Amino acid sequence: KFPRVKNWEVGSITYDTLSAQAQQDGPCTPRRCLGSLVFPPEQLLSQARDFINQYYSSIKRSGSQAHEQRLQEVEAEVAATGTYQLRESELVFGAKQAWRNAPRCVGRIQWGKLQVFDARDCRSAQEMFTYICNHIKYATNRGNLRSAITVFPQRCPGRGDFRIWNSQLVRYAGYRQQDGSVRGDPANVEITELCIQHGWTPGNGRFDVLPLLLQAPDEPPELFLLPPELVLEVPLEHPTLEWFAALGLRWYALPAVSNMLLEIGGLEFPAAPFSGWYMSTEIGTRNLCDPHRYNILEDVAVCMDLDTRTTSSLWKDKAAVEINVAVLHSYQLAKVTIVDHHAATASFMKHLENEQKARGGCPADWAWIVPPISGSLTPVFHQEMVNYFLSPAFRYQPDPW
Amino acid sequence: FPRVKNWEVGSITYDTLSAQAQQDGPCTPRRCLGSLVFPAPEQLLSQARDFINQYYSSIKRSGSQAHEQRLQEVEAEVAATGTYQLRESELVFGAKQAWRNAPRCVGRIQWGKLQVFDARDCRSAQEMFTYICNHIKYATNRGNLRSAITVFPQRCPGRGDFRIWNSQLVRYAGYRQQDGSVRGDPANVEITELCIQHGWTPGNGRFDVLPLLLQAPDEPPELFLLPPELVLEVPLEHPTLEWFAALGLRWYALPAVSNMLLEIGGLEFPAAPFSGWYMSTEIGTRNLCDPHRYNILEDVAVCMDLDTRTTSSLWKDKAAVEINVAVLHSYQLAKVTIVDHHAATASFMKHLENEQKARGGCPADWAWIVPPISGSLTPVFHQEMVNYFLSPAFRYQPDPW
Numbered sequence: 001k002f003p004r005v006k007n008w009e010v011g012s013i014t015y016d017t018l019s020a021q022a023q024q025d026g027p028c029t030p031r032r033c034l035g036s037l038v039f040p041p042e043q044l045l046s047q048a049r050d051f052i053n054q055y056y057s058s059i060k061r062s063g064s065q066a067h068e069q070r071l072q073e074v075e076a077e078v079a080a081t082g083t084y085q086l087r088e089s090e091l092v093f094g095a096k097q098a099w100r101n102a103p104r105c106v107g108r109i110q111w112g113k114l115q116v117f118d119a120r121d122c123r124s125a126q127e128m129f130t131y132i133c134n135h136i137k138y139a140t141n142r143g144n145l146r147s148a149i150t151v152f153p154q155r156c157p158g159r160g161d162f163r164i165w166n167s168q169l170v171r172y173a174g175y176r177q178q179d180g181s182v183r184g185d186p187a188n189v190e191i192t193e194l195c196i197q198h199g200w201t202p203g204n205g206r207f208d209v210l211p212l213l214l215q216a217p218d219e220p221p222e223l224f225l226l227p228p229e230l231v232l233e234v235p236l237e238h239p240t241l242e243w244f245a246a247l248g249l250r251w252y253a254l255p256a257v258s259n260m261l262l263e264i265g266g267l268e269f270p271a272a273p274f275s276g277w278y279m280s281t282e283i284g285t286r287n288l289c290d291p292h293r294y295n296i297l298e299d300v301a302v303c304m305d306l307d308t309r310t311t312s313s314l315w316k317d318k319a320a321v322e323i324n325v326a327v328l329h330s331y332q333l334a335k336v337t338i339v340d341h342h343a344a345t346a347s348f349m350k351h352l353e354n355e356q357k358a359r360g361g362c363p364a365d366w367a368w369i370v371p372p373i374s375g376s377l378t379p380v381f382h383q384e385m386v387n388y389f390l391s392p393a394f395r396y397q398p399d400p401w
Numbered sequence: 402f403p404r405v406k407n408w409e410v411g412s413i414t415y416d417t418l419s420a421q422a423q424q425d426g427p428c429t430p431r432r433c434l435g436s437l438v439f440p441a442p443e444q445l446l447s448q449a450r451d452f453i454n455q456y457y458s459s460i461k462r463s464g465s466q467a468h469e470q471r472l473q474e475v476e477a478e479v480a481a482t483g484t485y486q487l488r489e490s491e492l493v494f495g496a497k498q499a500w501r502n503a504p505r506c507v508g509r510i511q512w513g514k515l516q517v518f519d520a521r522d523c524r525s526a527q528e529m530f531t532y533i534c535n536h537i538k539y540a541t542n543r544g545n546l547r548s549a550i551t552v553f554p555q556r557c558p559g560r561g562d563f564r565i566w567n568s569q570l571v572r573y574a575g576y577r578q579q580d581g582s583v584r585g586d587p588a589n590v591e592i593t594e595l596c597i598q599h600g601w602t603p604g605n606g607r608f609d610v611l612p613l614l615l616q617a618p619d620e621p622p623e624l625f626l627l628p629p630e631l632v633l634e635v636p637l638e639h640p641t642l643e644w645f646a647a648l649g650l651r652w653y654a655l656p657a658v659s660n661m662l663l664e665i666g667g668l669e670f671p672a673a674p675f676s677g678w679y680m681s682t683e684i685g686t687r688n689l690c691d692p693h694r695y696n697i698l699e700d701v702a703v704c705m706d707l708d709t710r711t712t713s714s715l716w717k718d719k720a721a722v723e724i725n726v727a728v729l730h731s732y733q734l735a736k737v738t739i740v741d742h743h744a745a746t747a748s749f750m751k752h753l754e755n756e757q758k759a760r761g762g763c764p765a766d767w768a769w770i771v772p773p774i775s776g777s778l779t780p781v782f783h784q785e786m787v788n789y790f791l792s793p794a795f796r797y798q799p800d801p802w
C-alpha cells in the first residue's frame with residue numbers, strides 16, 4: 001500500500017509512506033496517467049487544525065502548553081469573523097513548508113533557508129510596489145542571490161484581491177510586426193499588450209523589461225516602472241566564441257514567480273511572490289532555445305558553422321550545449337548566483353535522502369525535475385519518483401483578467 | 402475526456418481513445434506513479450470478443466456474417482477446450498496492434514509495416530532456434546533493417562511455456578571480476594551466469610555475444626550459440642576524433658526484444674521476439690553512458706581534454722553529444738539503419754496526428770518517449786500525453802528462473 005520506489009543507478013529501494021497524506025486529488029486515475037499535463041464555508045477549520053498540528057510537531061510541541069492554546073484562538077477567530085490570522089512564525093513555517101512541498105521544484109535542498117517578508121498590512125498599488133521593490137533589492141543583493149517570499153494580505157469575501165498581473169517580476173517585452181510575428185519574448189506578448197494598453201510606450205528592443213501591473217482590491221491596475229538600477233541583468237558572452245557577445249543576448253538575474261497562490265492552513269494569498277536563483281538550463285535551454293520562446297538555436301548554429309542540413313549532425317545538440325555554457329560563464333563572471341543542471345540534480349538526490357529520513361518520502365514531479373537537456377546524465381533520471389499533493393502548497397490560479 | 406495541449410504550437414485535442422482503456426494502471430487520484438519502470442472462461446471470452454470486434458472493424462466487415470460466425474465459433478471453442486485458436490490474418494493484425502498500442506515505443510509511425518512470422522507450430526527448442534536465426538537473418542537484411550516478430554505457440558492448459566530466457570536475441574556478456582567490477586555489459590551479469598551454469602564456455606571480452614537459452618515446454622532451457630555471421634555488428638568510430646576508434650567499442654545492428662509477452666484476445670504468447678532498428682540515443686546515451694552500463698563518459702571526456710573537475714564546464718553534456726555523433730556516423734558508415742532522436746521524435750509527432758484522426762488518441766508514456774539527451778529540443782517534450790493500456794499489447798513477465 002506504500003509505493004515501492006527504486007533507484008536504477010544503485011539498486012536501492014525505498015517506500016514512500018508520506019504519500020498517505022495527500023489532500024488535493026491529482027489528475028490521474030487507474031484508467032490513464034495524466035502526469036505530463038502542465039495545468040491538469042467552514043472547510044477553513046479542517047485545514048487550519050491540520051496546519052497548526054504540523055507546526056507544533058515540527059518544534060517538538062505536540063500535545064503541550066501552547067498547542068492546546070493556539071487551537072482555541074483560531075477556533076474563536078473563525079467563529080467570530082469567519083477566517084483567521086497566522087502567527088508570524090506560522091506564516092514563516094508555512095511558507096517554508098509550501099516550498100518543501102512543491103513537486104516541480106528541483107532546488108528544495110534549500111527549503112530551510114527562506115526569508116519571509118510579511119506584507120499583510122498592505123493597501124494600494126503604491127504600497128505593493130515598494131514592498132516588491134524591497135524584495136527585489138534584498139533578493140538580488142548585488143548578484144549574491146538570496147531566497148525570499150513576500151506575502152501580501154490574505155483573501156476575504158466581499159473585498160477584491162491583491163494580484164500581480166505579471167507572471168514574474170522581471171519579464172521581457174513581446175511586440176508584434178507588420179506580419180503578426182513577435183519581437184522580444186513571445187511568452188509575455190499578452191501582458192505586454194495589457195501594459196501598452198494601460199499607457200506604456202513600447203520600446204524597440206528585444207530585451208526591454210516590462211513594467212509591472214499591480215492591482216489593489218476592487219481597483220483597476222496601475223502601471224509602474226521598475227527602477228532600472230534595481231533590475232540586475234547579465235549580458236551573455238561565451239568564454240571562447242568571441243562572436244557570441246555580438247548576438248546581443250541578455251537575461252535577468254532574479255527568477256521571481258508572481259502569479260501563484262500561497263495556501264497555508266486554509267488561507268489563500270493570491271499575491272505572494274517567491275524568488276530564488278536560476279538553474280542555467282532554464283535560461284539557456286527553455287528561455288533561449290524553445291521554438292515558441294526566443295528560438296535562437298539555429299542562429300547560434302550558423303555562427304558555429306554547424307551543418308544544419310541534416311538533423312543527424314546533432315547541430316541542435318551542439319548549439320544548445322554552448323548556449324548553456326555561455327549562460328553559466330556570463331553569470332559567474334558577473335558574480336550572480338547560478339546553478340548548473342548537474343550540480344542542482346545531485347543536490348536534489350541529496351534532498352530526497354534527507355526527506356526519506358525526515359518525512360518518509362518527498363513529492364516529486366519526474367517530468368519537471370529531470371533537466372531539459374542531458375536528462376539521463378543526471379541522477380534524477382534513474383530515480384523513480386512519486387507525485388502527490390501536500391499542504392501547505394503553492395497552487396496555480398486563473399489570470400486576473 | 403482528457404484535454405491534451407501541444408505547448409510549442411498551441412494545438413488542443415481530446416483523448417477519447419483513453420475512455421476504452423481496459424486493464425488498469427498504477428496511478429490513483431491520490432498519487433501519480435507514471436515514472437515507475439515496472440508498476441475463468443467468461444473473461445477469456447470477453448477479451449476475445451473485444452479483439453474479434455476489433456479485427457472485424459479493421460477489415461470493414463463489422464456486424465457481418467463472418468463476424469458473428471467467428472464470435473459463435475470462439476465461444477464454442479472456449480466451451481469445448483477452455484481456449485481457442487487465432488486465424489492467421491487475425492494473428493497478423495493483433496501483432497501490429499500490439500505495436501500500435503505500446504506506450505513506450507517512439508517508433509510507432511512504422512506500426513503497419515511489420516513482418517509477422519507464425520511459428521505457432523514450433524515443436525521443440527531446436528526448431529525454436531531455427532525460427533530465431535531466420536528471424537535475425539530476415540530482419541538484419543545486410544544492414545537494411547526490417548521490422549519483424551516471430552510468434553511461438555501460445556500458453557495453453559496442460560503444457561508449459563515456450564520461453565526465450567535472454568532479454569534480447571543479441572546481448573553482450575557481463576563478467577564479474579577479481580576486484581568485484583564487471584567486464585562487458587553489467588545489465589547482463591545474471592543471464593551470463595546462467596549461460597555458464599548451463600554449460601557455456603565464457604570468453605573474457607567486453608563485447609562477447611551471449612548464447613541463446615531456449616526453453617521448450619516442461620524442458621530445462623537449452624543452450625544455442627548464434628552463428629557469428631548472423632550477428633551483424635558495427636565498430637564505433639568518430640568522424641573527427643580519430644582516437645575514438647582506439648576505444649575498441651562496438652554495438653550490434655539488431656535490437657530484438659525477446660522477454661515480453663504478446664497478448665491478443667486474451668490468449669498469451671510468452672515467447673514472441675520482435676525487432677526494429679535502433680534510435681541512436683539508446684546506444685550512445687543509455688547503453689554506453691549510463692553509470693551502471695559501459696560508463697565510458699568520463700573516459701571520453703578526459704580524451705577530449707575537457708575540464709572534468711567542474712560540472713559547470715558541461716563536460717558530461719559535451720562528451721555525450723560526441724558519443725552520439727560517433728554512434729550515428731558509425732552506423733551510417735556501415736550502412737546499418739539508424740534513426741536519430743530528432744527524426745524519430747518528429748515522426749512520432751506525425752504518428753499522434755494520424756492516431757488522433759484514426760482512433761481519437763494515442764497511449765504515450767512521456768518519460769519514455771522524450772529522449773534521454775536534448776529532450777526539449779525535440780517536439781515531443783512540449784506535447785502533453787495520456788498513458789493507458791490497450792489490448793492487444795506487449796506486457797512484461799517474470800524471468801523464467
Ligand code: HEM
Pocket residue numbers: 095099102104105106107108110114147148149260274275276277278279282339344368394
Ligand atoms: C533558490 C534556488 C532555486 C532553484 C535553483 C529553483 C529551481 C527550480 C526550477 C528549475 C523549477 C522549474 C520551473 C520551470 O521550469 O518552469 C522550479 C519550480 C518551482 N519552484 Fe523552485 N527554485 C529555487 C527556489 C525556489 C523558491 C525560493 C521557491 C518558493 C519559496 C520555489 C518554488 C517553486 C515552485 C512553486 C515551482 C513550480 C513552478 C511552476 O509550477 O511554474 N523555488 N524551481
Ligand code: HEM
Pocket residue numbers: 496500503505506507508509511515548549550661675676677678679680683740745769795
Ligand atoms: C522500427 C523502428 C523502431 C524504433 C525506432 C523503436 C524505438 C523504440 C525505443 C527508443 C524504445 C525505448 C526503449 C528503451 O528506452 O529502452 C522502444 C520501446 C518499445 N518498442 Fe519500439 N522501436 C521500433 C520498432 C518496434 C517494433 C517492431 C516493436 C514490436 C513489434 C516495438 C515495440 C516496443 C515496445 C513493446 C517497447 C517497450 C519496451 C520496454 O518497455 O522495455 N518497437 N521502441
Ligand SMILES: Cc1cc(N)nc(C#CCN2CCC(F)(F)CC2)c1
Pocket residue numbers: 107167168255256257258259274275276277278279282
Ligand atoms: C523560485 C524559482 C526559482 C527558479 N530557479 N525557477 C523558477 C521558475 C520558473 C519559471 N516560471 C516562469 C513564469 C511562470 F510560468 F509564471 C512560473 C514559472 C522559480
Ligand SMILES: Cc1cc(N)nc(C#CCN2CCC(F)(F)CC2)c1
Pocket residue numbers: 508568569656657658659660675676677678679680683
Ligand atoms: C524493437 C526495439 C527497437 C528499438 N529501437 N529499441 C528497443 C528496445 C529496447 C529496450 N530493451 C532493453 C532491454 C530489455 F529489457 F531486455 C528489453 C527492452 C526495441
Ligand SMILES: C[C@H](O)[C@H](O)[C@H]1CNc2nc(N)[nH]c(=O)c2N1
Pocket residue numbers: 035036037038367368369408782783784785786
Ligand atoms: C507537456 C510537458 O509536461 C511540459 O512540456 C513540461 C515538461 N517538463 C517541464 N519541466 C519544467 N521544469 N518546466 C516545464 O515547463 C516543463 N514542461
Ligand SMILES: C[C@H](O)[C@H](O)[C@H]1CNc2nc(N)[nH]c(=O)c2N1
Pocket residue numbers: 008381382383384385436437438768769770
Ligand atoms: C526511473 C526512470 O523512470 C527510468 O530511468 C526510465 C526513465 N525513462 C526511460 N525511457 C526510456 N526510453 N528508456 C528507459 O530505460 C527509461 N528509464
Ligand SMILES: [Cl-]
Pocket residue numbers: 255282287
Ligand atoms: Cl524563467
Ligand SMILES: [Cl-]
Pocket residue numbers: 656683688
Ligand atoms: Cl539495447
Ligand SMILES: [Gd]
Pocket residue numbers: none
Ligand atoms: Gd565566419
Ligand SMILES: [Gd]
Pocket residue numbers: 641642643
Ligand atoms: Gd581530428
Ligand SMILES: [Gd]
Pocket residue numbers: none
Ligand atoms: Gd585507456
Ligand SMILES: [Zn+2]
Pocket residue numbers: 028032033034035428432433434435
Ligand atoms: Zn499518473
